Structure formats: C-alpha cells, structure tokens
Design an enzyme around this catalytic site. Structure first.
Site: not given
Ligand SMILES: [Cl-]
Length: 377
Positions: A37, A222
C-alpha cells in the site's frame, strides 16, 4: 536473469482486492501475506482470529517481539482497525536479503478492513512518516529498512492485472519489467506520494479544465486503491467525454457511477468501443511534461455464469483529490525513487493490451505555469 531476478514475480492477488507480498515476522518465523500500500504508512498485521483470516500473527510465540505499550487506531477511506504497537524482526523472503527490527501494529479488532477471499492478512504502508498513526514519530517500515541496512532508498512496482501477480523490486530497478524509457515526475512533498497532473486527454481530446482542478486538493499514487479516483468536477467532465467517445454504444447512467455492471459473452468485449485516457505529469525540467496513457483494459475491471464476462467502470468520484490506483499502475512499471524525490513511469512488460493499442509513456511536451497547479494548505 538480471541481478534482481529473485524479486521478480513476488506479488500475488485477486483482481480488485489488492496485491500482496510474503513477509516473515518474529522468531521462530511467521510468514504472512501483506497488502502492498503506497497510500499509507503503517505496517500492521492481523493478530487475532477473524473469519476472513487463514492465519494471523501470534505474538506470544515470537521470542523477539517487544511490546511498545501503546494502542493504535487507523481509519482508512471506509475500513478501520484497532490494535497494539510493538517491534519484531521482519524479513521479506522474496525481497532484499536483510532482516530489520520494525514497528508492527498487531490488529486485534477491525471493521470492513479484511476482505473475504483476498488472501492478505496485513498491510505494508510504504508512504512517509507524516501520515503514520498515531503520529509521525512511528518510523515506517521502509524508513527502518533504509536506516538499518545498505538497501538503497528506492523501490519499484509492476502490478500485472487481469489471479493477478507482479513484482516489487526493493533497492533497485529491473529492466525486464518495462519497455521504452522511464519518465520521472517530482514527488511534490513527502507524505503521500504526491504528484502534479497538468493535463488530461480522452482519446487525444483535452478536457480543458484548469490544472488546479486536477490536483484539488492533492494527487497521489496509491497501490492500495483499485480505481482511478478523480475530484468531482473532473470526474463529471471525464465521464461526459468518455461517453461521447464511446457513442456507438449506449450504457445506463449507473454504469458510469460504478453501480451497474455490463457483461459481454466470453471473449467479445469491444475494447475498441472505449477511448484511451492520458494524464500529463509534471516533468523534471522547467516547462516540460510527459504523458501516461491507459487503455480500457485498465479502467474496465473484470468482475469474476462462466460464459459471461462482466465489467465494472473503475473510474470514480473523489472528494479527497486524484488517486492514481491500480487502474493507472497496471499500465506501468512505477519507480518510487525516494532518494531522488521522484516517481518514474515506463510501459509495463506485463500490462494487458490488445493487437491494436498499448499503454504508453510519451514525452517530452511543453506545459507552461505548472507551478500553479498544486494545492496549497
Ligand atoms: Cl538485497
């Protein structure tokens, strides 16, 4: 075999559920699947039974676990978890050949965080300390890795879409993972991986919005987000333009809102129905930009009868800025060059395309007044 060959193909995942890497925690070893992440900064692992977890971290079995005697709570876009902070030995078996003592949040309770069938048991937040919980004093994993070892301050991601896989190369770049040249955009500020978008085109047609709108109130890269998320005004303009370019076919309003799926018979998807989408990014030289272009193969996501291929439109509205999620990243090899405060893009050697069109990274272009595009808090 390049020098980083043992890190190639170290990611797995289910489509739309995120990409994960194996990480080994504690002593004796406990290996878990960990979501990669780039949009957060905590390393956290399931540490108690949960109906969606096959395994979890058992602190009492780790002789090297050290309790920090502090709780931690992280709210995500709609998931949240609570847990307890400590440190333990951490290695990545298909990553760098080092072991570090890292902060680890042991997740004891959660709401809508774990995903049934995703196969991941924790999260590796690769962004900067500014956005760590409880605060910026909690050193993130990658910072620990760089501080404690010789590993260069850089990692790169090749996310291969449509059972997914990919590579996270830690401490360098693997040239087998891309074609053509790498093009770099500055990291505007070290918190999220914040970048600046300076122009948007749909099938070569400029959306013609002020660039301040593209980055209101930030634009980030992201890997933990599936969609390309766009600020409301940009999303509305983009949908209008994509609809116009795909005129030959009609789709219900809810399809563009991601509330309705459209299915085709196996192998008949008229990818040619849909336009390519280009984002121009600020370059490394004054007044210079470059563009990345994705295909419908990236933004129309397969949702898994076996004879029907169903798709969700994976561009969506945001109130917290542009998010360049897996929809973008799946077109490209993306280099997170922390040492030089920049992010590189090149055409991915694994990206899903067809015989007629491919994802692209092109430049240079001339774009003036790019220093005005960014939002100021
Ligand atoms: Cl290494």
């Amino acid at each position: 075999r390049g020098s980083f060959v043992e890190m190639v193909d170290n990611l797995r995942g289910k489509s739309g559920q995120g990409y994960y890497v194996e990480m080994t925690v504690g002593s004796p070893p406990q290996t878990l699947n960990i979501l990669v992440d780039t949009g957060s900064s905590n390393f956290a692992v399931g540490a108690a039974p949960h109906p969606f977890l096959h395994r979890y971290y058992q602190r009492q079995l780790s002789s090297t676990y050290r309790d920090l005697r502090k709780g931690v709570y992280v709210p995500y876009t709609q998931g949240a978890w609570a847990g307890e902070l400590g440190t333990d030995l951490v290695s990545i078996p298909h990553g760098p050949n080092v072991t570090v003592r890292a902060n680890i949040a042991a997740i004891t309770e959660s709401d809508k965080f774990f995903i049934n069938g995703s196969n991941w048991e924790g999260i590796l937040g690769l962004a900067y300390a500014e956005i760590a919980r409880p605060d910026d004093s909690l050193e993130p994993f990658f910072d620990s890795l760089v501080k404690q070892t010789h590993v260069p301050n850089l990692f790169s991601l090749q996310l291969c879409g449509a059972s997914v896989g990919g590579s996270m190369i830690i401490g360098g770049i693997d040239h087998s993972l891309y074609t053509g040249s790498l093009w770099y955009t500055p990291i505007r500020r070290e918190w999220y991986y914040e970048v600046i978008i300076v122009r948007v085109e749909i099938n070569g047609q400029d959306l013609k919005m002020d660039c301040k709108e593209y980055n209101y109130d930030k634009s980030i890269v992201d890997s933990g987000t599936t969609n390309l998320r766009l600020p409301k005004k940009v999303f509305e303009a983009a949908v209008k333009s994509i609809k116009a370019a795909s005129s030959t076919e009609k789709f219900p309003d809810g399809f563009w809102l991601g509330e309705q799926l459209v299915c085709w018979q196996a192998g008949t998807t008229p990818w040619n129905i849909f336009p390519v989408i280009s984002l121009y990014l600020m370059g490394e030289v004054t007044n210079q930009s470059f563009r990345i272009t994705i295909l419908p193969q990236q933004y129309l996501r397969p949702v898994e009868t076996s004879q029907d291929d169903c798709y969700k439109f994976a561009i969506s509205q945001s109130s917290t800025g542009t998010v360049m999620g897996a929809v973008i990243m799946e077109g490209f090899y993306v280099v997170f060059d922390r040492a030089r405060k920049r992010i590189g893009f090149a055409v991915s050697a694994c990206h899903v395309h067809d015989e007629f069109r491919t994802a692209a990274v092109e430049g240079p272009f001339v774009t003036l007044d790019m220093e005005d595009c960014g939002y100021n808090i």
